[PDB]
Amino acid sequence: KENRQSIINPDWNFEKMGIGGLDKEFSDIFRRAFASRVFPPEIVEQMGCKHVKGILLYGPPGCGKTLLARQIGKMLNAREPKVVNGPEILNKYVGESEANIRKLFADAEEEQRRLGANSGLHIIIFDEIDAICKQRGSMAGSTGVHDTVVNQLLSKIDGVEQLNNILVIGMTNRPDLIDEALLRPGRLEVKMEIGLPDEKGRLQILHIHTARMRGHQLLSADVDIKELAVETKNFSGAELEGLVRAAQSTAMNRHIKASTKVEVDMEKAESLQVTRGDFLASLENDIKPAFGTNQEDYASYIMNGIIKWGDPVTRVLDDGELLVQQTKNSDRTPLVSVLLEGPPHSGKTALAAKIAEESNFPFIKICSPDKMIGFSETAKCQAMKKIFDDAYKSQLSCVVVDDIERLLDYVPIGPRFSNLVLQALLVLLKKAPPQGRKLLIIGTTSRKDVLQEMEMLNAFSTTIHVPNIATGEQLLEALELLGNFKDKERTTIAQQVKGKKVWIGIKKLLMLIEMSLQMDPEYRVRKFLALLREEGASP
Amino acid sequence: DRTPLVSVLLEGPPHSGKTALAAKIAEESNFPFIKICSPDKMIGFSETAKCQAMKKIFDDAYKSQLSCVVVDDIERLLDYVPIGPRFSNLVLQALLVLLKKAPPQGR
Numbered sequence: 051k052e053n054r055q056s057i058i059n060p061d062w063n064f065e066k067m068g069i070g071g072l073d074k075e076f077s078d079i080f081r082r083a084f085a086s087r088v089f090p091p092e093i094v095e096q097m098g099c100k101h102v103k104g105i106l107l108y109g110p111p112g113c114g115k116t117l118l119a120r121q122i123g124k125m126l127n128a129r130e131p132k133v134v135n136g137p138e139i140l141n142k143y144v145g146e147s148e149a150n151i152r153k154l155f156a157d158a159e160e161e162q163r164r165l166g167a168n169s170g171l172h173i174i175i176f177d178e179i180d181a182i183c184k185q186r187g188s189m190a191g192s193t194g195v196h197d198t199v200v201n202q203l204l205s206k207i208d209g210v211e212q213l214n215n216i217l218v219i220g221m222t223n224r225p226d227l228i229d230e231a232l233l234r235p236g237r238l239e240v241k242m243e244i245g246l247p248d249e250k251g252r253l254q255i256l257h258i259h260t261a262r263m264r265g266h267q268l269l270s271a272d273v274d275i276k277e278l279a280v281e282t283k284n285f286s287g288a289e290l291e292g293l294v295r296a297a298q299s300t301a302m303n304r305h306i307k308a309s310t311k312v313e314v315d316m317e318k319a320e321s322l323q324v325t326r327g328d329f330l331a332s333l334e335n336d337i338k339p340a341f342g343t344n345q346e347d348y349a350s351y352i353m354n355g356i357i358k359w360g361d362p363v364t365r366v367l368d369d370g371e372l373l374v375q376q377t378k379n380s381d382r383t384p385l386v387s388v389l390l391e392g393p394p395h396s397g398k399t400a401l402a403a404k405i406a407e408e409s410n411f412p413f414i415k416i417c418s419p420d421k422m423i424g425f426s427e428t429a430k431c432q433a434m435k436k437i438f439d440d441a442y443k444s445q446l447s448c449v450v451v452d453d454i455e456r457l458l459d460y461v462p463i464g465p466r467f468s469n470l471v472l473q474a475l476l477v478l479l480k481k482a483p484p485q486g487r488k489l490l491i492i493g494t495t496s497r498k499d500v501l502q503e504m505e506m507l508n509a510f511s512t513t514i515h516v517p518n519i520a521t522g523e524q525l526l527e528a529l530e531l532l533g534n535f536k537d538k539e540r541t542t543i544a545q546q547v548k549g550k551k552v553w554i555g556i557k558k559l560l561m562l563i564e565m566s567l568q569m570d571p572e573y574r575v576r577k578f579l580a581l582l583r584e585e586g587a588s589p
Numbered sequence: 590d591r592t593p594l595v596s597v598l599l600e601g602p603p604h605s606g607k608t609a610l611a612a613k614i615a616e617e618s619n620f621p622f623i624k625i626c627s628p629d630k631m632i633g634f635s636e637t638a639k640c641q642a643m644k645k646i647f648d649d650a651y652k653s654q655l656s657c658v659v660v661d662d663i664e665r666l667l668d669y670v671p672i673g674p675r676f677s678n679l680v681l682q683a684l685l686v687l688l689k690k691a692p693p694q695g696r
């Protein structure tokens with residue numbers, strides 16, 4: 051009796067493979083690939099369907115492709131897979147690459163010819179498949195060796211003769227360069243995408259990578275995984291594995307004295323522990339992601355924090371909260387916009403960054419003009435296009451565009467500016483993203499009239515005003531919050547300024563105070579007043 | 590500490606001897622890195638090159654704990670001529686953006 055030897059090893063447990071955050075992808079792969087080989091063969095023969103012989107995996111670096119491939123190779127009860135490490139098949143002579151490819155499908159052919167339908171399963175793994183296979187005719191100058199390899203591969207996977215007992219797996223990082231004729235159904239059907247995880251996936255990974263430590267009581271009692279899951283934002287699996295190793299190394303480093311002449315290991319290795327301080331240090335010093343925006347940017351954009359010197363500082367934030375709530379909840383207006391306005395030295399960028407921070411959205415990015423110094427027009431256009439494209443991929447996103455008047459080069463003489471960048475902005479502000487996704491755009495500028503004159507202010511849904519310090523009470527409140535002057539001096543300052551109206555931006559006040567402090571203690575207040583008197587006003 | 594970047598403009602009528610005073614101030618600062626970005630070394634350069642050379646001089650100054658950079662004849666740097674008027678816009682934008690870029694934290 052030709053017993054239907056299961057293609058699944060008897061001792062196989064999903065938890066054994068130790069993959070986290072990829073339940074749906076694995077479910078789909080298992081359904082569309084290995085479903086036909088597990089059910090009793092009589093029904094399948096009645097249906098008359100032939101099995102699938104292809105899988106393709108792609109995604110950004112460090113998401114877990116090779117792990118899936120290795121685990122799948124280990125799961126099946128079949129012969130050892132044949133693995134190709136990049137372009138191992140190219141050779142100098144003529145007609146040796148094609149032979150090297152043909153040598154891979156020998157056992158499959160012979161076994162199919164001998165045993166017919168009742169045959170084992172043969173697996174072949176391709177790694178970095180974009181090194182050998184490419185669009186036919188794109189390359190030129192290789193002497194014709196990168197144009198027959200693809201033809202041989204195509205003729206072999208599915209040709210006049212028919213095989214039914216192979217499974218080819220491919221991995222790549224640039225899915226757009228592979229040949230089109232190699233992706234049609236019947237050759238490489240199941241195309242999957244492996245992407246960054248969400249909070250639950252990160253928690254699963256962090257639980258998978260600490261089970262061994264937790265088992266042996268080497269992990270302290272104050273380590274809470276939820277906080278780490280929340281704090282590590284935009285991390286990909288590889289980074290989440292690296293952080294734990296960094297913490298472990300910093301924990302082990304406390305028992306080695308290497309400054310002395312000879313390395314010596316103390317015998318307090320017993321009672322070892324890993325404390326939360328190690329995790330915080332590892333987060334703050336060693337590992338840093340490579341996607342999205344991080345603390346290194348919000349540190350620079352908001353340099354001196356936010357202080358409540360009056361009423362407007364709350365009004366602006368409340369309006370931002372209302373706008374973000376509207377963006378998140380509603381469904382009939384996927385795209386929203388807003389404009390921030392005010393006189394120079396008012397603090398527009400800080401408020402925009404604060405609102406973006408408090409939005410709490412998954413994806414945040416900032417497009418400032420100081421990262422493209424010396425660029426021509428086309429470079430600016432392409433950079434903006436790339437940022438917005440990366441913004442489209444996610445579910446709901448927020449983007450900030452600061453200093454519009456210098457993103458397009460404006461100078462009153464003339465006037466002069468770039469038409470291309472203006473057209474790019476005017477077209478990008480009226481493009482809705484793919485269905486089921488939401489986008490918020492904030493913009494900052496210091497000259498409303500020019501924008502009105504160019505007919506760009508009609509593309510913004512609404513505008514928000516950013517006022518400026520106007521009364522002595524607000525100035526006294528600002529001074530008391532900053533607390534650089536003493537009460538005795540503050541009495542004279544109030545006695546003087548309160549009998550007048552002031553007009554001075556917040557950012558200018560810090561510079562004025564810093565300039566004032568340089569003088570001697572006895573002449574400070576006077577100097578400060580003088581500077582204020584020279585500032586003037588023009589409401 | 591609050592303000593890591595400060596700047597100042599020396600101005601006056603012609604033939605008054607102002608670049609010498611700026612050089613003296615820079616020399617008496619006693620800072621480690623002191624460099625003079627002058628148009629004497631940009632004869633025949635197009636706009637792209639002026640912009641890139643300015644950027645390099647301003648990048649070399651981000652790798653020292655203290656610095657002082659002198660710009661000379663802002664008028665000649667823009668190629669300004671009273672007729673028209675006519676000048677370069679890319680260089681002006683570079684300058685206007687390069688006077689507000691704070692250095693890496695701690696310098």
Ligand SMILES: Nc1ncnc2c1ncn2[C@@H]1O[C@H](COP(=O)(O)OP(=O)(O)OP(=O)(O)O)[C@@H](O)[C@H]1O
Pocket residue numbers: 068069070071072110111112113114115116117223255258287288291
């Ligand atoms: N889902 C996951 N669960 C557990 N560990 C993971 C996971 N994803 C990644 N890792 C860790 O990170 C490594 C990811 O390396 P992998 O070979 O999968 O990367 P890759 O996507 O092929 O990268 P490359 O772009 O360099 O080709 C795994 O070996 C494991 O160390």
Ligand SMILES: Nc1ncnc2c1ncn2[C@@H]1O[C@H](COP(=O)(O)OP(=O)(O)OP(=O)(O)O)[C@@H](O)[C@H]1O
Pocket residue numbers: 351352353354355356357358359363393394395396397398399400401496556557
């Ligand atoms: N209430 C506040 N709102 C905004 N910024 C504040 C406030 N209090 C203090 N600041 C500080 O003021 C500075 C804000 O300067 P910012 O870069 O926003 O200026 P700006 O108005 O965009 O300038 P410019 O008009 O020159 O383009 C930051 O240091 C911020 O920390």
Ligand SMILES: Nc1ncnc2c1ncn2[C@@H]1O[C@H](COP(=O)(O)OP(=O)(O)OP(=O)(O)O)[C@@H](O)[C@H]1O
Pocket residue numbers: 602603604605606607608609610
């Ligand atoms: N007290 C002083 N201040 C300035 N320059 C002085 C003084 N005493 C002597 N000099 C000399 O005067 C000359 C100053 O010329 P400088 O190069 O400063 O001209 P400038 O004002 O920059 O010229 P221009 O406006 O035509 O470009 C130098 O020789 C300097 O040595």
